Design a protein around this ligand. Structure first.
Ligand code: MG
Length: 427
DNA sequence: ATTATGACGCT
DNA sequence: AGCGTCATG
């Protein structure tokens, strides 16, 4: 029934904003956003405080426009180094959080601001340790139970709803009404409360979490009650939760596959997938996608929390849109060098911290007039952490791309440059 | 003129 | 080895 594991997804609330707010107390509890590159339209917003979100401020919005919706919006700018955004401060902040989480359980770094947590073992330890002990509501001060309260005064307030639902849940657990998987999830949520308290105490950062039996449900659960709260999605809550859940909300269905599911099957909500046989879904969407959809619409997913706290690749890139697109050989080389230099510093830090060395260098560019993130990818050996070598090699593998008869000019002009270090080995 | 940056499946 | 999809600060 896909109730074998206890899995959490912890997500730092508006992470880059919290990083700037911890550093500059004047930004705390105010409508605030983080932007990069001030010159064009005041900067592109990449993170927004909940206070600012209330005014309709969103990410991918220009700061000048965000200021129209929210006149008192405060802005913090991403550091800029060698002509490009420098995300070091947030990478370092993210490391502080991951190292704390890693104390409680096996962690999978999902992105700069989120990680999956496999609590299956930690739960078992706590249960035998706490054998015969009832779980108090006081152990779950920030936990929502999805789907509760239900059934025929304080409910007008959201904290009231939260407690009433928690009490119904706990009372059921205590009387033996709710299952052993439900108990495991509950102890799981207790551990996540502790993890989230430790993160806040030791970093100042708040986060939300979802607790369920797999990564997809835990990630969905996480988004149900934000900010600074955590949500338990039990196996039993799935039918009602999915019954009105737009397909695009489920992890991996937010794009073309999701749209094709909706269009081909003529459905809107996740629960509607249950009517189809596994073979039916495999026929439309392929063997892997079909099997996954068949189990997922019933709340079952088997993808493991991978034990990996460290990124698999180390990369950096810069876009050069419109007029800014690079048109000279000298220009391309100079930006490659800027990219290579950031990369050298990050790689050397990586090698000292994490005892590994990258062995491959991937060069990626986007040619002018191409919509895809990458027009092309070429690879070469990464044999030394030297910015001059890396930029020189990077140029060598892409220099053929140039269409111009003249040596100096570059055609077609470049929309993007990207360097990625990959294929790490123990050092 | 979403920017910068990830993990991953398919081939 | 290189490309497409999906995600998000
Ligand atoms: Mg997030």
């Amino acid at each position: 029934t896909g109730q074998d594991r206890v899995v959490a997804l912890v997500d730092m609330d508006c992470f880059f904003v919290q990083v700037e707010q911890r550093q500059n107390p004047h930004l705390r509890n105010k409508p605030c956003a983080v932007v990069q590159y001030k010159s064009w339209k005041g900067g592109g917003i990449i993170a927004v405080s909940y206070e600012a979100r209330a005014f309709g401020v969103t990410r991918s919005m220009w700061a000048d426009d965000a200021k129209k919706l929210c006149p008192d919006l405060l802005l913090a700018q991403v550091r800029e180094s060698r002509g490009k955004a420098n995300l070091t401060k947030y990478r370092e902040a993210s490391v502080e959080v991951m190292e704390i989480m890693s104390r409680f359980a096996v962690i999978e770094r999902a992105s700069i601001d989120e990680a999956y947590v496999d609590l299956t073992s930690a739960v078992q330890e706590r249960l035998q340790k706490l054998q015969g002990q009832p779980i108090s509501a006081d152990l779950l001060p920030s936990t929502y139970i999805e789907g509760l309260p239900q059934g025929p005064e304080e409910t007008v307030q959201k904290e009231g709803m939260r407690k009433q639902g928690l009490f119904q849940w706990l009372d059921s657990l205590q009387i033996d009404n709710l299952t052993s998987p439900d108990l495991q999830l509950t102890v799981g949520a207790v551990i996540v409360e502790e993890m989230r308290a430790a993160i806040e105490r030791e970093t100042g950062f708040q986060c939300s979490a979802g607790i369920s039996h797999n990564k997809v449900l835990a990630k969905l659960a996480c988004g149900l009650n934000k900010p600074n709260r955590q949500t338990l999605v039990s196996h039993g809550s799935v039918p009602q939760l999915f019954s009105q859940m737009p397909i695009r909300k489920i992890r991996s269905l937010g794009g073309k596959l999701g749209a094709s599911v909706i269009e081909i099957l003529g459905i809107e909500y996740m629960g509607e997938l249950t009517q189809f046989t596994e073979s039916q879904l495999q026929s439309h969407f392929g063997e892997k996608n079909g099997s996954w959809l068949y189990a997922m619409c019933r709340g079952i997913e088997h993808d493991p929390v991978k034990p990996r706290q460290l990124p698999k690749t180390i990369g950096c890139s810069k876009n050069f849109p419109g007029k800014t697109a690079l048109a000279t050989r000298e220009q391309v080389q100079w930006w490659l060098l800027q990219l290579a230099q950031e990369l050298e510093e990050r790689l050397t830090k990586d090698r000292n911290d994490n005892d590994r060395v990258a062995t491959q260098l991937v060069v990626s560019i986007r040619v002018q007039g191409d919509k895809r993130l990458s027009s092309l990818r070429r690879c070469c050996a990464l044999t030394r952490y030297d910015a001059h070598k890396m930029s020189h090699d990077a140029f060598t593998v892409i220099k053929n791309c140039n269409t111009s008869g003249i040596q100096t000019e570059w055609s077609p002009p470049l929309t993007m440059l990207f360097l990625c270090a990959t294929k790490f080995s123990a050092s």
